[PDB]
Every structure is written in C-alpha cells, then in structure tokens.
Amino acid sequence: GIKVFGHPASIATRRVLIALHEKNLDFELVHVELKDGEHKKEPFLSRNPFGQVPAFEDGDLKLFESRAITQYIAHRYENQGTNLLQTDSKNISQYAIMAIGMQVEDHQFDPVASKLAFEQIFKSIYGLTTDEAVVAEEEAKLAKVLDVYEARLKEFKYLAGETFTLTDLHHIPAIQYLLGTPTKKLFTERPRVNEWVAEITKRPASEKVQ
Amino acid sequence: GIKVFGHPASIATRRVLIALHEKNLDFELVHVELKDGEHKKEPFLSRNPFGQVPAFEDGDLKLFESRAITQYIAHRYENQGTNLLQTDSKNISQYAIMAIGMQVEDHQFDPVASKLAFEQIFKSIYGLTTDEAVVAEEEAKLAKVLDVYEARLKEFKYLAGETFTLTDLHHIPAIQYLLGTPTKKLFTERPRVNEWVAEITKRPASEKVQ
Amino acid sequence: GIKVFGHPASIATRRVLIALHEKNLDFELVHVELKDGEHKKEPFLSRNPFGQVPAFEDGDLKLFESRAITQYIAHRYENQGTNLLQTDSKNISQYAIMAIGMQVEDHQFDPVASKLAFEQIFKSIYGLTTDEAVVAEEEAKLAKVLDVYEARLKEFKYLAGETFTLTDLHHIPAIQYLLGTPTKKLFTERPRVNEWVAEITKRPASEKVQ
Amino acid sequence: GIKVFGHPASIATRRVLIALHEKNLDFELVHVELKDGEHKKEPFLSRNPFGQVPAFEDGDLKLFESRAITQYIAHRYENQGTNLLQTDSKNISQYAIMAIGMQVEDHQFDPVASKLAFEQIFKSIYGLTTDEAVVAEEEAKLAKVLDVYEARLKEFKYLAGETFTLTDLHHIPAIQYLLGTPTKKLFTERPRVNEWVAEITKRPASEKVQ
Amino acid sequence: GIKVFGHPASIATRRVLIALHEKNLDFELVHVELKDGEHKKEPFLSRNPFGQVPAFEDGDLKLFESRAITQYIAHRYENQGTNLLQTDSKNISQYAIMAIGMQVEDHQFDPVASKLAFEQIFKSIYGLTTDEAVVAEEEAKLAKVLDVYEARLKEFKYLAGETFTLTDLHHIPAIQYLLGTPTKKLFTERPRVNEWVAEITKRPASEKVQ
Amino acid sequence: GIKVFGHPASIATRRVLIALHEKNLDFELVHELKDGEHKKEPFLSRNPFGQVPAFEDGDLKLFESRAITQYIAHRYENQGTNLLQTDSKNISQYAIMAIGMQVEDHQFDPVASKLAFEQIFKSIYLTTDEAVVAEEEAKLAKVLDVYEARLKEFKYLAGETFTLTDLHHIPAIQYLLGTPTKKLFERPRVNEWVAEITKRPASEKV
Ligand SMILES: C1=CS/C(=C2\C=Nc3ccccc32)N1
Ligand SMILES: C1=CS/C(=C2\C=Nc3ccccc32)N1
Ligand SMILES: C1=CS/C(=C2\C=Nc3ccccc32)N1
Ligand SMILES: C1=CS/C(=C2\C=Nc3ccccc32)N1
Ligand SMILES: C1=CS/C(=C2\C=Nc3ccccc32)N1
Ligand SMILES: C1=CS/C(=C2\C=Nc3ccccc32)N1
C-alpha cells in the first residue's frame, strides 16, 4: 500500500499527509526517529540519500521530496476526493499559473516562514533563546511577500485561480505553526490573506495533521 | 509571439533560454536593465511582483519563475525539437522520478552552486574580495551533494532516467559558470558526474547561451 | 503539591524532571503547548515573564529557570532520595567546587552542545537543512571543552568530586540528545568522559525522561 | 591569603573585586598579562583550564569562574561586612528567589549588555569601527529585558527582595561600562531601573573598581 | 604603451579608466575574463598576486591596486589634460588635505557603497535575492557618512578644496552604480552632495566609462 | 606644536606615534573612549567620523592615521629617518611604495586586526571564537605567502629601504606577536622582516 516515512511534527511530512487526507486515501505513517539520528543512517538513506523526511512509498514506487510527492498524489489519484490540480487539469496555461505559485511558495514564502516558526516555536521547545532581531528582520520580509499575496488574492479566490490547489495546500503546515505565534498579526492585518488563511486552515484535512 | 524579459548573464534567464533553444523556438530576448533598477519598478513589477528576472510572455499568457516557465515550454511545445519531458511523457511514476530531481536541483544544488559562482566570479567582476572561507565551506557541501549525484548517475545515464530531461537542463547555467573556476575540480574528480557535465554543457542549445 | 510547567522534549524541563525523579518525588507535569504559542502569552508569562519553559510550583512557591529549580530541589528535599549536593553539604569550599562546575556547564558546555543538538536533530524534525559547516565549527569547540573535562575526570570520579552532583546532572539532557548523533564520537573517543557519560545516562532517573 | 588572578578592566574580574570590597576583605590583585597571551599558557591554565580571567585563591582553595567565586565569598565570609545573601540566609525559598535573578543576569542581561559595551567601548579603544546595526539590534533586546526588570523592581526594592544581594551585585561591572555610552538612555528612561542603577553604582565598593 | 588589465564593469577598473580619460591618454583596455577564472590563474597572478582587477602597465612599469595607479597617473602625466592633484601640487599641507579625503573614501564610503551596489544591482543580474535588511542597515550607515560629506561640501566646492581632485574622482564609479538604485534618494536629499554628484558624474571622462 | 589626540593602545594611534618617533619629533599625546569622548564634541570637530587618532600641527588639523603618517613623512622629510623612498621625488618608486601601503590597508589590516581582536581584546574585557581565528589565520597565511615572495626579491616591501609601507604594519604585528598567530610569521623572509621592523627603537617606544 501507501507508506509515508516521516515525523508528524515535520512541515514537509505534514504537506504530504494533508494531500493524502484531501484525497481520502489510506496510508501508514511510519515514524522515523530523528531523535536517534535514524534519518542520517541506513536504511533510510536508501529511501532518501539526502537524509531528510519525508520519504514515501506507493507499492513498488519509491519517492522523496514533499512537493514532488504531493504532485504525484494529485495526478495518480486525480479522480478521488478533492481535486488538487486545476479544474481543467490538462490545460497547459492553467497548469503553468499553478506551477508559478508552487514555485513562489518554495522560494519566497517557505524560507522566511520556516525561519520565523523555528525561531519563535522550535527553539523554545528545546531550550534556546529566540533571537528577537532575526524575528523582526524576517517579519519585515514576510510582510512584503504577503503584500504581493494580498494583491494576488484580490484578483482570485485562491492563488492559482478560482479553486483550491496544490499551490495553496503547500503553505498550510508552515502557516499552522505561525498561527500560534505573534506573526499571526501579519496574516490577520491583511484582509484577503486572512480570509484565505482561515479557509485553508479550517479544512478537515488540514485539521487532521495539527 | 514569445518574449523573455531578462538579462543574458542571469542563471534563471539562461535556464529559460536553453529550453527555448532546445525546442527550436523563435523568441525575442527583451533586455531588462537591472543596472538602472528596472526590475524593482513598474512596468516590470506587473510581469513579476517579486521583481526578479526572468519574466516571460507567450502571446496573451504572462509567466514568471524560471522552472515554471521551462515546464510550460516542455509541455506546450512537447512535439517540437528535443523532448524535455520523459520519453513516456504521460507516465505518472516516471514524471514523479523527474520531479524529484527537479526538486533536488532547487534545494540541494542551486543554493550552494550559486553561492560558489557568486563568491568566485561575480564578486571579482565588481570589485569585492572573494571569501576563501565561504568558498571552502560551500565546496565541502557541494562535494557531499555531488557524491549523491555520482551514485545516482552510476545507475542511470541522466538524472531522471535514460534520457536528458528538465532535471538535467536546470543545472546547466550554474555549472557553466562553475567550470570557469577551481570548483571544476569537484566535477572532474567524479567520473560519472564529469561525463554528465561534459554531455549537457556540450549540447548546442547550452552553448548558444554562454 | 509539586507542578512542573513545561514540555517533555525540552532540555531545561528534563533537567528539572531528572532532579525530581532522583529525589523520588511525586509531581504533575503540566504540558505547556508551545506549538500554540502558550509560553509567550498569559497566564504563563505570570509564571515566567521571559516566556521560557520550564516554570515550577511547590505549593505556594512559584519558580522558573531550570538550574535555580534543581538547586531548590537539592536543598528543600535534601534528606530524601539521592543526594544532589556534595556529601558534606554544608562545607563552603566543597560547595564552591560544585558551583564552578555548574557555572562551567552553563557557559562552556551548554551553548555549544545545544547548538549541535539543534542543528542535527531539531532542524531535521521540522524540515530545515543541517548546516554541515556550523556542526564542524561547534564540534571543534566541544572537543576542546571535552579535553578539559577529560583532564578533570582523570583526577575525580565525577566533576565536583567523588559523588554524583547537580554539576553532573545538569549535563544529562543535552548529552542524551547528542548520543543520537555522530557527535557521540567526541564523547566516546575520550576514555574517562565516555565512562562518565555512560554512568550518568544509565541512571534510572535519567532513563525516565528519555 | 586571598589572591585574585585577573585584569582590572575585566567585567568578570570586577564582579569578584566588588564582592571582596563589599566584604571589607584584604586581597592581592595579581595582574594577568592578557596582552602577552598569559591566560592561554601555563601556569594560568592550571588555575583555569578554559583560559579565562579571573582565577582565584583563598589559601589552599583554588577557584575560577566569577559567579561561583562571588557565591563562595558571600558564604565563607558571611558575618563580615555587607550581607550579600538574603537577610534570612538559610531560608531555601528566599535563596531560590535570589538564584533565579542570578540565573536571569547570566542568561538574559549579560550576553546583550556585554555585546553593547564591547561594540561601543572596547572596539573603539583598539581601533575597529562600531557596528551601528548590531548596537541597535541589541539595544532593542536590552530594552525588552529592562522592561521585565522595571516590572520586577516595581514590586521590590532590589531584584531578590528588600535587600541588595549577589543578584544585583553581578550586574554592576557591565552597567558601569554601559553608563559611559548612549545605552544609558535605556536605564534612565525607566524610573525604578534608573533608581536601582543609581543606588548600586553609587556604592563605595562599586566605585573602588571603576 | 599604456595597458589596463581589467573588466569594464569593475569599479576599481573604472576608477583607473576615468583618470586615464581625464588625462587625455591613449591606452589599451585588455579584458580579463573573470568568468573563466582568469584573474585567479597565471599569468595574471604575475601582474597582481592577490588576483584582483585591475592590473596596469606603462611600458616597463607594472602596477596593480587602483588608488595607487590613479596617483601614479596624476603625477607621471601631471602637465597633461585635467589636473588631478591640487592646484599647488607640490604644497605638502594641501596634499595632506587631499590624502585625508582619499583615505576617507576608502575607509568610510567604499565599503558601504559597494555593498549597497552589490546587494541591489549585481545580485539581481546573476539571480540572487536582494536582502532588504542589509540594504536598510547600510543605507543608514551611508546616510551618516553623507551628512559628514554635506558639512564638508558646505565649506568647499570639492572635497579636497576649490578644485576637482583624485579625492572626488575615486568616488565616481560606485556613485554611478548607486544612481540606478533607490539609494540615489540619499544623494538627492542632501543639497551640496547632490550638486557635487551631479558635477562629477556629468564630466565627459566619467560618462566615457558608463 | 604637534598634538596627537588618541589612545596609547590604539593601532591607528600607534601607527602615527611610531612615525613621529622615527622623525625624532616632539609632541603631546592628548588622551577617554571609555567615557565615550570620541563620539561627542569637541572631538567630532577634529574627526566627524568619531575615531582616533585626530592630529594637530599648529593650525593644521588632520585625522586618519595613514594620511597623517604621509604628512609627517613629507613635512618633516629632512629630519630623522627617511620614511619615503631614497629617491623621494621619483614618481615610479613612489607608486611602488603606494601599492604596498594600499595592500596593507586592504589585504593585511582587516584580517590581522580581526585576529588581534578575537585573541587579545576580547580576552581583556568575551570568549575567543576559535572558528573565526582559524578562518582568518588561513586568510592571513595566503596573504603572508604573497609577502614572502615579495620579500624574497627586496629587503623591504617598497624596495631596499624601510618606508611607510613597512611602518604601517607594525602596531598590528606587535599585538599578533603575543599570540599563537606568531607561528605564521614559519616564513623565513617574513620572519626576518618582522624582527627588523619590530626591533626598531621607535617601534619599541610605543
Ligand atoms: C501565477 C501567475 S501570477 C502569480 C502570482 C502573482 N502573485 C502571486 C503571489 C503568490 C502566488 C502567486 C502569485 N501566480
Ligand atoms: C528520483 C528518485 S531517486 C532520485 C535520486 C536519488 N538521488 C538523486 C540525486 C540527484 C537527483 C535525483 C536523485 N531521483
Ligand atoms: C571545580 C573546580 S575545578 C573544576 C573543573 C576543572 N575543570 C573542569 C571541567 C568541567 C567541570 C569542572 C571543572 N570544577
Ligand atoms: C525571582 C522570582 S521572580 C524573579 C524575577 C522576575 N523578574 C525578574 C527580573 C530580573 C530578575 C529576577 C526576576 N526572580
Ligand atoms: C581633510 C581635512 S578634514 C576633511 C574632511 C572632513 N570631512 C570630510 C569628508 C570627506 C572628505 C574629507 C573630509 N578632509
Ligand atoms: C609593488 C609592485 S609589486 C608589489 C607587491 C607584490 N606583492 C606585494 C606584497 C606586499 C606589498 C607589495 C607587493 N608591490
């Protein structure tokens, strides 16, 4: 069957889990003990030689890298559950529009957002002091990025068009984490972003991985 | 027709240009004067609100972000010139394998490679001193990455399988730059990588953008 | 009764838990949801205005800061379970010797060790890439620190003298995490350090918090 | 007799010197020539293997690490001069309160304050340019920390209660340095902090080390 | 004859080219292919062992380092074209005044200005994201520096006195680059600076290298 | 007369003091960075960038150490040691000296000063960063190899005579000699050069 080799707290792992749930699919979440360094030793390195979670299995097919896995799910299980591709899924122009947003989340949003979530949650869990200077710097960054998102969301219900797609889905785990932190201010202060956040984080598949 | 709004030295712009040439397509390269800050002002911000090159046009369709653009080219002009997708282009498993590698270039290769190319070439052009410490740090990184590439290339002719694909194409511009620098050692000292580099950089479409 | 307001993965929280277990004390571990930003909001800020875990309660007495809490435990519940102070607990010279080591763990060991554990474990769990350069830098640091520990442990069974004390206890949570990482090499390669690590990590109270 | 092995400009050394003076004790200040790298060679490494000042001697007893030394002084010479412990010195609850504050100075105050003092004073002495960006970053930090101090000092005359203690003493050397810098603004602009600074820096023992 | 071994985009190379043009001299600009790492290999290392552009030749005389080369030009070809030294060129007091300004450009202006120009232009050309935080930090710096320039220019037509000298010349290439960036605001907002910029950048020799 | 407004521990201030001593000149060393004097008036009227040293020779008001040493070298040329080239008006030979001066400022000083600071000045007040030390030592090593090659062809950096080019290195080198970085200075012709210039009476006075 389908197996996800990861960790339930992992943003990348959650990104995959949401897509599976969105597709009403049954799978086994095989826990990788990162705490014991399992990810940096065999046999996990045979599933992903870069030693990051998640790795993935669908029968004989062996994948890693979360965005590639969500895409695979979106296509292989297209007719099942929520459509994660564009309504007209074979339309090349419309796919490109979606692809740009996917690309934007990876390059503009994730690095900043993940740094924020890490400085202000994960640090605190393990026992290091949050760097207020870093937080401020990255908040200023994310603010400028979210202004671009606001403009985009003023012209379309979701980022790739009129429907919820992979483009939106990929943001969810990081946003979830940032909503338990003062950085929520940036999402809330922007009307169309705030509505978008609220719609995508309130989805049942999104709540299943919290 | 087709317009590319970018700069001929730009890695991301070159990534798009190679794909166009590989597809034997005719296009106009519209030069964006980054030197005069054109990219950070209208009307370029209407083509890409994040203010990076390249932006792209195919008739009425307006894109940005290089990897999204190359994918669009690969699909919209699939029949034409070199096949940039997998031989069996509609096969979902085989697409996923390609998608992983595309993902790997973006996350594991590009950040390190670009930093190297920048510290060693672009700094020198302008007049800043190369940081020998940074170079060494990143070379150690890229080495570990390229070992994973060696292992992969021992099992397959190219990164996504038996054929040259987008996965390989996306590496070219950065590699081109690094070949004029002592970092070439890392590519040469690895047999299957060295052959792979040599095959992809010697392609006519790759040379047209040097 | 006794309540610990923290998180079970937290190094500082574990430091307190071990001292409680070592004293055979009964307590409630009240989970603080850092993931929902509980620590940076009231009413937790009334228990610790710097918004870090753990906070602590012993009836009416409200404390924070792990080393202060372990000291309090060591004194208030002195006659009970393991002695965490020096054998001659009222001896001022012997206390000072212990105090130096406590001070050393805080200043020389913890910052480096925690950075290591964070770069290698906690980063991987959330989905950020380990910085191999940082790991190397800090491993070189810890090595130099652990050489000083080796010399010290060659003259005494434990760090403060012939008995296990707070000085040793405070190191445990960080060491536990580092034992599931290639940084174990540094502890193992040093004979008396390795014996010391093995003795303190194998204690029942130490294992209860793993 | 009593020897302090250090340097008169050293914050950590001054911390010890103030405690000795506060206790009306006689001692020899043995100057360590850090300029000639004395601290990183024998025989100083036999007094402190981590090669930092100050080291300390009280007859046969050999100590290092300033906070451990001040605590030792506070206890060994308890009935002499100023009481540096709590009025009810054997009270375990009241000690813990003091211990928290000691812990807070070390973790929250000292790293920021010392960076400030270093960027603004020590850099200028030797001939490096002050980084205005760093100054600003750290001033923002210290401000937030000092707000917590303000709140605390609104409820108590000194940090550990109604009396001057080690908790307060340990702040003095760093504060002295910062008072000759625009960072004084942060101390002055906060009423109860300003009163506290003025009281502790005006003490005769505090002036003796300026 | 005279040869300049450099690159036309290089600030340091331009600094030399302007001085040559200002002196109406004929020379060959020999292009060093930094892109192919020519600067870090022989035979260029025989012209400058630190591997930076520009190197320089005047018959048998072999020089490197731009400010030394411009000085050499200013003296060796003193009676030709524009006077780049002070009107009373042998006056030791007046030379010292010029020398201070030359020193000021190197230490106070260039490092900041070059970072700005690099973060905003050169990064964008090659494909890295501008760090807005860095930009802001350095803009604050340059502003303070330019206030000192404003005060100076209120008392004198140019930086070294009543005439255009090397002191002014050396600023040109960096200023040229910054004029195509929002950092122009800092120059425009200061009256005497703005006039100075406008005069020196509008000189025919300055325009020849744009 | 001549005043130097600085601090005796300051590298830049020492650079000026050595040049004055080398020229057998009499001056007053006017001393408080500790009380933030450098960042307030009236010092800002002597140097608006708020760094030491500032300098006075009668009515003439200077700042910036390399500019001051050059001024000394020229205004008091016939007095004491010659700090310019033997043929002081020769434009080719001046340029050779100027390159070296430029090299010290750009290639040597930033690295050397970071080293001296991480290893000495930090310790006087903060923990030395062993990683930084190593990074910068690798840098300085490469720089000093270039110096070795240069010193193999000439007695001093600008030619056959001791000049400003050499002088400007002294204060930083002095500090680095009390530190394990001395090891790097393992380079024969560099070692001899360091020994000659640091043993000079004017060098020892500061
Ligand atoms: C696709 C065409 S234009 C576009 C976007 C334009 N602004 C965006 C912000 C977030 C995600 C996507 C966009 N995406
Ligand atoms: C697709 C399935 S496994 C895999 C790879 C496994 N190692 C790789 C290195 C570079 C690019 C791709 C890979 N790619
Ligand atoms: C107490 C007196 S001397 C001393 C130490 C001397 N070296 C140490 C290394 C780790 C912990 C403690 C020490 N501790
Ligand atoms: C002890 C119980 S609560 C507490 C503090 C609560 N806020 C503080 C700020 C500086 C030093 C100590 C404190 N100290
Ligand atoms: C020479 C004596 S004071 C002085 C300057 C005082 N402020 C300046 C700013 C830019 C260039 C030179 C100066 N130059
Ligand atoms: C002048 C022509 S070549 C040259 C140098 C060539 N290498 C150097 C190292 C330190 C100082 C000067 C030089 N200086």
The residue ranges of every structural domain in chain B are 1-85, 86-210
How was this structure determined? It was done by X-ray
Closest approach of chain D CAs to the CA of A90, in angstroms? Answer: 51
Residue C98, CB-side half-sphere exposure with 13 Å CA sphere? 24
Q: Which of D106, D112, D137 to mutate to test the interface with A (most CBs of A within 10 A)?
A: D137
CB E22 within 8 A of CB B137: no
Q: Distances in Å between the alpha carbon of D84 and those of C93, C118, D65, D162, E105?
A: 17, 38, 18, 12, 54
Residue A11 main-chain phi, psi, to 5 deg: -55, -50
Neighbours of C188 (CB within 10 A): 13
Give contacts of E124 with chain B, Cβ < 8 Å: 34, 39-40, 52-53
Interface residues from chain D to C (CB-CB < 8 Å): 49-50, 61, 63-65, 67-69, 71-72, 75-76, 92-93, 95-96, 99-100, 102-104, 106-108, 148, 151-152
What is d(CA B8, CA D132) in angstroms, rounded to the nearest whole number?
Answer: 38
Going C77 to C80 to C86 to C87, the CA torsion angle's sign is: positive
Structure tokens at C178: 């580092």
What is d(CA A149, CA A146) in angstroms, rounded to the nearest whole number?
Answer: 5
Residue C126, CB-side half-sphere exposure with 13 Å CA sphere? 28
Structure tokens at D22: 């506060």
**Which residues of B does the annotation place in the binding site?**
10-11, 39-40, 52-53, 65-66
Query: Is F100's C-beta closer than 6 angstroms to any atom of ligand 6?
Result: yes
What is the enclosing helix (H) or strand (E) of B28? strand B28-31
Nearest C-alpha in A relative to C125: A10
Nearest C-alpha in B relative to F139: B132
Start-to-end CA distance of chain E, whole Å, equals 24
- Specify the amino acid at residue C36: D
CA angle (D147 as vertex; D145, D152 as ends), nearest 5: 100
The full DSSP string for chain D is -EEEEE-TT-HHHHHHHHHHHHTT---EEEE--GGGTGGGSTTGGGT-TT--SPEEEETTEEEE-HHHHHHHHHHHTTTSSS--S-SSTT-HHHHHHHHHHHHHIIIIIHHHHHHHHIIIIIHHHHTPPP-HHHHHHHHHHHHHHHHHHHHHHHH-SBTTBSS--HHHHTTHHHHHHHHTSTTHHHHHTSHHHHHHHHHHHSSHHHHTT-
- Specify the amino acid at residue F87: D
The CATH class of C86-210 is: mainly alpha
From the CA of F68, which ligand is nearest? 5
User: Cα D89 from chain centroid?
Assistant: 21
What is d(CA E31, CA C176) in angstroms, rounded to the nearest whole number?
Answer: 59
What is d(CA A43, CA D70) in angstroms, rounded to the nearest whole number?
Answer: 53
What is the enclosing helix (H) or strand (E) of F90? none
Residue F131, CB-side half-sphere exposure with 13 Å CA sphere? 15
- Specify the amino acid at residue A9: A
Residue E21 main-chain phi, psi, to 5 deg: -65, -45
Q: Distances in Å between the alpha carbon of C15 and those of C30, D53, D124?
A: 15, 28, 41
The CATH class of E1-85 is: alpha beta
What is d(CA A85, CA A74) in angstroms, rounded to the nearest whole number?
Answer: 6
CA angle (B78 as vertex; B76, B84 as ends), nearest 5: 115
Q: Distances in Å between the alpha carbon of F73 and those of C34, F20, F22, F70?
A: 66, 9, 10, 5
**Residue A53 assigned to a binding site:** yes
Q: Distances in Å between the alpha carbon of D167 and those of D10, D69, D84, D89, F153?
A: 19, 14, 9, 14, 62
Nearest C-alpha in C relative to D91: C76
What is d(CA E116, CA E133) in angstroms, rounded to the nearest whole number?
Answer: 11
Q: Distances in Å between the alpha carbon of C57 and those of C24, D7, D95?
A: 17, 41, 15
The strands making up C2-6's β-sheet, listed across from edge to edge, are C28-31, C2-6, C55-58, C61-64
Structure tokens at F7: 């601090």
What is d(CA E16, CA E169) in angstroms, rounded to the nearest whole number?
Answer: 9
Closest residue by Cα to residue A145 from A172, A106, A92: A106
CA angle (B58 as vertex; B56, B62 as ends), nearest 5: 50
| Homologous superfamily in CATH for domain F1-84 | Glutaredoxin (3.40.30.10)
Q: What is the 3-state secondary structure (H, E, C) of E138-177?
A: HHHHHHHHHHHHHHHHHHCCECCECCCCHHHHCCHHHHHH
Closest residue by Cα to residue D48 from C138, F119, C151: C151
Tokens 């000093």 belong to residue: F144
CB D57 within 8 A of CB D8: no
Q: Which chains touch C (3+ CB pairs under 8 A)?
A: A, B, D, F
Q: Is A172 exposed, middle or buried (0-12, 13-18, 19+ CB in 10 A)?
A: buried
Structure tokens at E167: 């002191």
| E strand segments, chain A | 2-6, 28-31, 55-58, 61-64
Helices (H), ranges, chain E: 11-22, 66-76, 92-104, 110-117, 123-126, 132-155, 166-169, 172-179, 184-188, 191-201, 204-207
**Structural fold of domain F85-206:** Glutathione S-transferase Yfyf (Class Pi); Chain A, domain 2 (1.20.1050)
